[PDB]
Amino acid sequence: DVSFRLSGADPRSYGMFIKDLRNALPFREKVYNIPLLLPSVSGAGRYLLMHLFNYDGKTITVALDVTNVYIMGYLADTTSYFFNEPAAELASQYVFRDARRKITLPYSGNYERLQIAAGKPREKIPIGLPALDSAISTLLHYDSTAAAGALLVLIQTTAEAARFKYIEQQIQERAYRDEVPSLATISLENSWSGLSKQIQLAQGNNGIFRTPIVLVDNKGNRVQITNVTSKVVTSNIQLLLNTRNI
Ligand SMILES: *[C@@H]1O[C@H](CO)[C@@H](O[C@@H]2O[C@H](CO)[C@@H](O)[C@H](O)[C@H]2NC(C)=O)[C@H](O)[C@H]1NC(C)=O
């Protein structure tokens, strides 16, 4: 497992947890120097367990699919909560097996669904480390509408930051203060599958992508990523979703 404690959390222990997360995820190869997530993993080995501790010392256990970095569910005391989706239900045969009770949230785990549930687009919701603390806190007692808003923070602060160095940097900047995500952060989160796929297709095409990716990179600029020499590729993107899962 991987852990993180908000009490005494600075941009540094956060960098250490994010490094630790990416490192817990299996891969056999590197594509242009970026780890390539497995196509599949069978059994319980398919799920990573993340322990998050709020400022006060309370925790939740977050279940993660090692294949795509999608959050499956979480445990808060003796209750497990899972998204209403097949992968999460199958995830439930392998983890939080001793929870006294299991609740299925009234929504699946994609941004679109979580945003309808919360009543706000993630562009209008602040993230940072304080926001992570609040989210842990709120997932500790059930409220489906509020949980949706806390899942939107948690997902960006763990999964999205492990996928992109730019996003992990954004969070370290919001370590003592929250702030809505930039235009650029949203764009990256949304093109990960797109980009993951174009990097894979570029092998054998001289690093040239078959279909250009439109991104917004810092300062609000509307850019097109055409090949592997681009900065998003060489520096940013830290994990690639296998094309067999796109
Ligand atoms: C691969 O990547 C770089 C950018 O990361 C591209 O270079 C641009 O190419 C266009 C068209 O020829 C120029 O007008 C730009 O000013 C170049 N920018 C930089 C920063 O180099 C490169 O074109 C891409 N490779 C190919 C084969 O197109």
Task: Please tell me what the overall shape is.
Answer: globular
What's the end-to-end separation, in Å?
26 Å
Oligomer: monomer
Bound molecules: a molecule of 2 linked components (NAG-NAG)
Number of strands: 10
Structural class comes to alpha+beta
What count of helical segments does DSSP give? Answer: 8
Tell me the CATH architecture of the largest domain.
Answer: 3-Layer(aba) Sandwich
CATH topology of the largest domain, which one?
A: Ricin (A subunit), domain 1
Q: What is the level 1 CATH name of the largest domain?
A: Alpha Beta
Radius of gyration, taken over Cα atoms and rounded to an integer in Å: 18 Å
Enzyme class: hydrolase
Protein name: Ribosome-inactivating protein momordin I
Family: Belongs to the ribosome-inactivating protein family. Type 1 RIP subfamily.
Pfam family, one: RIP
Q: Outline of this structure?
A:
With 246 residues, the protein is α+β, with helices and mostly antiparallel strands. The chain is 38% helix and 22% strand.
Which secondary structure elements does this structure contain, and how are they paired or packed?
Elements: E1 2-5, H1 11-24, E2 27-31, E3 34-37, E4 47-53, E5 59-65, E6 70-76, E7 79-82, H2 86-91, E8 101-104, H3 111-118, H4 129-139, H5 144-163, H6 165-173, H7 183-202, E9 208-215, E10 223-227, H8 231-236
Parallel strand pairs: 1-4, 7-8
Antiparallel strand pairs: 2-3, 4-5, 5-6, 6-7, 9-10
Helix pairs in contact: 1-5, 1-6, 3-5, 4-5, 5-6
The structure holds a molecule of 2 linked components (NAG-NAG).
EC number: 3.2.2.22
Family: Belongs to the ribosome-inactivating protein family. Type 1 RIP subfamily.
GO biological process, one term: negative regulation of translation
